[PDB]
């Protein structure tokens, strides 16, 4: 998955989740998470958003 | 979103009986398919589910040993072979999408009766 | 694994009243993973709500979910005649192990 256009509106649970990786405010739209998924995909989270925050220091321990 | 199930089926107790469940797309690269039943005046009861780019299911251990779920790529259709079959195997089974970060069954197919009696 | 428990079995309201049911769990479901489903007779369930509170897909506004935990309520604010139906809570946070509550009817007083 290349750049973020559209955010995630739906919080996911980090059982659901395998890694993250950030993505910048340049060369590329807008600066995002991108949360690799326990089922091979990849969604785009709001990196302001509270739950995204805890999710990636979660999957950091 | 449509799930197409095949016919009402007549089986005799100690056989088995294979459901299908076609989902419109070819779109089972993003989502599941869970079974899921329903006796007469009875609760939903999970069976089990597979989300395609896995391979393999997971199944409900009321039925562990006698169910096997499988799904075909090249035609996006789901299915539910269930053995061993009782009575209390008469029920109306249910295919229905799923997304496997969530898990809420969010489209149903319209329904399979399995009618299991000598 | 996780055994969904709904009260009451039958619940007897006349129009417009409101319906409040009940659905706890045997452990804590971990991200508000739970849905509500409604069936009327003869019907494939219908998805009512989903993550605990989220409203689903073209469904009236009176019907509403809250809770997490083990605590979970559905609730119908303005019960409708056509709301004659039995109701089911469903945890997915075990993804190997989907589980459902044993149904709460809701019937029309007269």
């Known amino acids: 998955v290349t750049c973020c256009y559209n955010f995630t509106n739906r919080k996911i649970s980090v059982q659901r989740l395998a890694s993250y990786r950030r993505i910048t405010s340049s060369k590329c739209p807008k600066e995002a998470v991108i949360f690799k998924t326990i089922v091979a995909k990849e969604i785009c989270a709001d990196p302001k958003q509270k739950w995204v925050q805890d999710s990636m220091d979660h999957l950091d321990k | 979103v449509e799930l197409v199930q095949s016919g009402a089926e007549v089986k005799k107790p100690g056989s088995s009986v294979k459901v299908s469940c076609k989902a419109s797309?070819?779109?089972?690269?993003?989502?599941?398919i869970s079974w899921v039943r329903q006796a007469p005046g009875q609760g939903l009861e999970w069976m089990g589910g597979?989300?395609?780019?896995?391979?393999?299911?997971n199944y409900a251990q009321k039925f562990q040993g006698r169910v096997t779920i499988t799904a075909d790529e090249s035609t996006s259709t789901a299915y539910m072979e269930l053995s061993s079959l009782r009575s209390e195997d008469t029920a109306v089974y249910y295919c229905?999408?799923?997304?496997?970060?969530?898990?809420?069954?969010?489209?149903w197919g319209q329904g399979t009766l399995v009618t299991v009696s000598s | 694994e996780i055994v969904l428990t709904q009260s009451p079995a039958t619940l007897s309201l006349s129009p417009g009243e409101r319906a409040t049911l009940s659905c706890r769990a045997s452990?804590?479901?971990?991200?508000?993973?739970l849905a509500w489903y409604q069936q009327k007779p003869g019907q494939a369930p219908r998805l009512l709500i989903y993550?605990?509170?989220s409203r689903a897909t073209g469904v009236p506004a009176r019907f509403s979910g809250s809770g997490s935990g083990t605590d979970f309520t559905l609730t119908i604010s303005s019960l409708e005649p056509e709301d004659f139906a039995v109701y089911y809570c469903?945890?997915?946070?075990?993804?190997?192990?989907?589980?459902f509550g044993q149904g709460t009817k809701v019937e029309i007083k007269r």
């Open positions: 597979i989300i395609p780019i896995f391979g393999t299911a």
């Open positions: 229905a999408r799923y997304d496997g970060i969530y898990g809420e069954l969010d489209f």
């Open positions: 469903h945890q997915y946070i075990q993804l190997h192990s989907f589980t």
């Open positions: 452990q804590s479901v971990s991200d508000a993973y």
């Open positions: 797309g070819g779109t089972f690269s993003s989502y599941g």
């Open positions: 993550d605990a509170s």
